Each structure stands twice: as structure tokens, then as C-alpha cells.
Design a protein around this motif. Structure first.
Motif, PDB file in Angstrom:
ATOM      1  N   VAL A   1      45.001  45.009  30.008  1.00  0.00           N
ATOM      2  CA  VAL A   1      44.083  44.975  28.876  1.00  0.00           C
ATOM      3  C   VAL A   1      44.847  45.320  27.606  1.00  0.00           C
ATOM      4  CG1 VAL A   1      42.064  46.050  27.798  1.00  0.00           C
ATOM      5  CG2 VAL A   1      42.109  45.690  30.329  1.00  0.00           C
ATOM      6  N   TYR A   2      44.588  44.576  26.539  1.00  0.00           N
ATOM      7  CA  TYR A   2      44.990  44.990  25.202  1.00  0.00           C
ATOM      8  C   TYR A   2      43.878  44.616  24.243  1.00  0.00           C
ATOM      9  CZ  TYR A   2      48.135  46.254  21.350  1.00  0.00           C
ATOM     10  OH  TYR A   2      48.733  46.885  20.282  1.00  0.00           O
TER      11      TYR A   2
ATOM     12  N   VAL B   1      43.545  49.761  22.370  1.00  0.00           N
ATOM     13  CA  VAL B   1      43.387  50.219  23.747  1.00  0.00           C
ATOM     14  C   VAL B   1      44.353  49.400  24.582  1.00  0.00           C
ATOM     15  CG1 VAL B   1      41.882  50.268  25.789  1.00  0.00           C
ATOM     16  CG2 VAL B   1      41.001  50.973  23.566  1.00  0.00           C
TER      17      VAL B   1
ATOM     18  N   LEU C   1      41.098  40.837  21.759  1.00  0.00           N
ATOM     19  CA  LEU C   1      41.431  41.517  22.999  1.00  0.00           C
ATOM     20  C   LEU C   1      41.679  40.497  24.092  1.00  0.00           C
ATOM     21  CD1 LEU C   1      38.227  43.070  24.654  1.00  0.00           C
ATOM     22  CD2 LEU C   1      38.161  41.377  22.860  1.00  0.00           C
TER      23      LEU C   1
ATOM     24  N   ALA D   1      37.286  48.487  27.097  1.00  0.00           N
ATOM     25  CA  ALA D   1      38.181  48.371  25.948  1.00  0.00           C
ATOM     26  C   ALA D   1      37.395  48.444  24.643  1.00  0.00           C
ATOM     27  CB  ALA D   1      38.982  47.070  26.023  1.00  0.00           C
TER      28      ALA D   1
END
Length: 263
Positions: free
Chosen positions: A21-22, A32, A234, A259
Motif C-alpha cells: 500500500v502507498y 501511509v 493511492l 490507508a
């Protein structure tokens, strides 16, 4: 970062694989990050960047989007639900790009990769905007094999997020092409159960999904426009060690919500 990351660790334990996850808050710079620099298979999610690469070419080649591509029957491969309909007429580059983004159309993607110089040409476009992680190596449908340890046809959630930001929100593309990319992503039909499921219906979302199927491998990346606030970018990617490990859209949606809530 341990406290920010803790819920993802529990989610991936129940999932039985790895989640990456970004998320980037373009208003505050908050992020995050969880396995954000690990490589995951792209599956069909490269098709969003393919359409951005087509748009970039159209800045150097006026009318590129208008040009008809007339193809024969062996251009067709499964999961080509739009291009199959237009075998007897051809499609424009604009129509093929929309179909690749919004229906994940495989033959459309292969036709546009050919126009750009193959998978290497798309990779070269991504290098041109400073993405040194992205690599597309193969074509549809071989790129979907998602074999663990294979570096081909992979990127990282952070590289995907940063390139998506540059192309949709930054000025990597001229403003008309930029809005066209955003508009194609906002019209995606395949992502209703992934990041979109984590987002209030009031907020615009553009996204692109990938689903290799095998090896629990699936993903989604998106831009989210909260009303009257700065947008969020994201990416959520999954994989798993066994070929018959099931992917899960609910897991992607749950990781997106974690996120988004965490920014």
C-alpha cells in the motif's frame, strides 16, 4: 510507522499473502506506506499508464488519438469485450485507450503497445517521468503469469502512486491530455468493489484495476477527490505464495479504507 502499519499486517495474515500500500495526501504531504517498495505484478494495471503514454505521444503527434486502427481476427484474445465488437470496422486510438482503461480490454492494450514500440516502449515512457521501478516486459496475456520471484511485469505501490500523481495531478502531461487521462480513469467500470468501495459516493474517483487471478494477485490504484479538499493518490497491490491462493477484492477495499483513514 509501526502504529500506522499494524492493521495491514493483521489484514495480510488473514489474507494469507502480502499486501502493498502507498497513499499520498496531496494537501498535507501525509503518506501511509506498507511494503510500499516491494515489487508486485502489474496485471492489467499497466493499462492506465499505457493510456498516459499514448496521450504523451499525442502531444508530439497531433491527431494521434483520431487515427483508426484496423485489425484482423488474430488480434483478438480473451477479455477483449470492446475490441471484439469492432473487428469489422476498426477502432480509433482514443477508443482503444478508453477500452483498455475502462474495460481492461486485452486486444486494445496489445494494439496500443504495438503503437508505442511494445512493452519496452511503455517502460521507456515511465523512465522518462522518473519512474525507475516500473517494468513491462511481456504482452497480453503472458504478462499475467504472476510467478513468485519473477521481476518481469512488476512495479511497487509507491512507484505506481508517484507516477499516477505526476500524470493526473502534476504537469507531466499537458493540461488537455491530463484531463483526458483523469476522465478515462473516472469512467472505469471494473473497480466498483476495490478502492471505490472505500470512498464516499459523493467523492469522485478514477481508478485502474489488475487481476492476474493466480497467486492471489490483484490490485487497484486511484485518485480520489474529496469535496473541496486536495486529492489523494493511492495504490493497493496483493500477491500470495501458491498458484491457487485466491485474490480478494474485499481485502483490497479493506486496505484502501485503512490507508485513507490513516492519512
Amino acid at each position: 510507522t509501526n502504529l500506522v502499519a499494524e492493521p495491514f499486517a493483521k489484514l495480510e495474515q488473514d489474507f494469507g499473502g502480502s499486501i502493498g500500500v502507498y497513499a499520498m495526501d496531496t494537501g498535507s504531504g501525509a503518506t501511509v506506506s506498507y511494503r510500499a517498495e516491494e515489487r508486485f505484478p502489474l496485471c492489467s494495471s499497466y493499462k492506465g499508464f499505457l493510456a498516459a503514454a499514448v496521450l504523451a505521444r499525442s502531444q508530439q503527434q497531433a491527431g494521434l488519438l483520431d487515427t483508426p486502427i484496423r485489425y484482423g481476427k488474430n488480434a483478438l484474445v480473451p477479455w477483449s469485450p470492446i475490441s471484439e465488437k469492432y473487428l469489422t470496422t476498426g477502432m480509433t486510438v482514443a477508443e482503444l485507450s478508453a477500452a483498455a482503461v475502462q474495460y481492461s480490454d486485452n486486444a486494445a492494450a496489445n494494439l496500443l503497445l504495438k503503437e508505442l514500440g511494445g512493452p519496452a516502449g511503455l517502460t521507456a515512457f515511465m523512465r522518462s517521468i522518473g519512474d525507475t521501478t516500473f517494468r513491462l516486459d511481456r504482452w497480453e496475456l503472458e504478462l499475467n503469469s504472476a510467478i513468485p520471484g519473477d521481476a518481469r511485469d512488476t512495479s511497487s505501490p509507491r512507484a505506481v502512486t508517484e507516477s499516477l500523481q505526476k500524470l493526473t495531478l502534476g504537469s507531466a502531461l499537458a493540461a488537455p491530455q491530463r484531463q483526458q487521462f483523469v476522465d478515462w480513469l473516472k469512467g472505469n467500470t471494473t473497480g466498483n468493489h476495490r478502492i471505490r468501495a472505500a470512498v464516499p459516493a459523493d467523492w469522485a474517483v478514477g481508478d485502474k484495476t489488475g487481476t492476474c487471478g493466480v497467486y492471489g494477485t490483484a490490485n487497484d490504484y486511484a485518485v480520489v477527490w474529496p469535496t473541496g479538499r486536495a486529492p489523494i493518490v493511492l495504490a493497493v497491490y496483493t500477491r500470495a505464495p501458491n498458484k491457487d491462493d485466491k485474490h480478494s477484492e474485499a481485502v483490497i477495499a479493506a486496505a484502501a479504507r485503512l490507508a485513507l483513514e490513516g492519512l
